[PDB]
Amino acid sequence: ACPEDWGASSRTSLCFKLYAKGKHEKKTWFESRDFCRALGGDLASINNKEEQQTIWRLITASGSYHKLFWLGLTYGSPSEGFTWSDGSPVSYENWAYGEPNNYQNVEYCGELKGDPTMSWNDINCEHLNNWICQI
Numbered sequence: 001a002c003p004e005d006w007g008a009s010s011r012t013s014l015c016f017k018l019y020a021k022g023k024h025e026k027k028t029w030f031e032s033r034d035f036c037r038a039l040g041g042d043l044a045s046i047n048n049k050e051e052q053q054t055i056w057r058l059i060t061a062s063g064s065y066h067k068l069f070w071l072g073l074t075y076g077s078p079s080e081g082f083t084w085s086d087g088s089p090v091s092y093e094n095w096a097y098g099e100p101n102n103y104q105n106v107e108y109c110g111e112l113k114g115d116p117t118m119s120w121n122d123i124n125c126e127h128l129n130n131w132i133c134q135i
């Protein structure tokens with residue numbers, strides 16, 4: 001069962017929470033990771049299409065589309081490439097077309113574009129974004 005406002009009460013329920021913020025309250029990737037971890041969770045990992053649908057439905061309910069959200073995607077060592085901050089393997093992927101492209105060699109964190117495609121993009125970790133936590 002999820003905490004109230006994070007999901008449903010069944011044993012199979014996945015718990016995610018959107019943090020959509022105005023520009024003065026958006027956070028860098030590291031700030032967002034630390035925020036979710038302080039609650040006992042982490043930035044959201046998306047391990048399968050079911051979790052993707054769960055998050056998309058939260059976005060539809062929020063009424064705001066096209067927003068960019070930090071996910072738990074962070075580059076590891078050169079041999080690893082992208083990892084999830086929660087330690088789970090990056091197996092399921094939904095990178096946008098041509099991504100990750102490490103544009104200008106400075107893109108080491110992953111964001112979700114909150115439109116129906118639910119696609120991922122690598123971007124500069126110091127950008128200020130909305131974020132999604134999991135617990």
Ligand SMILES: OC[C@H]1O[C@H](O[C@H]2[C@@H](O)[C@H](O)[C@@H](CO)O[C@@H]2O)[C@@H](O)[C@@H](O)[C@@H]1O
Nearest residue numbers: 068099101102103107113121122123124
């Ligand atoms: O800004 C770097 C970014 O540029 C291009 O992505 C565009 C768009 O698809 C992104 O959603 C937004 C927000 O991140 O930025 C651009 O408008 C692509 O070259 C992309 O790989 C790159 O990260």
Ligand SMILES: [Ca+2]
Nearest residue numbers: 101102121122
């Ligand atoms: Ca990119």
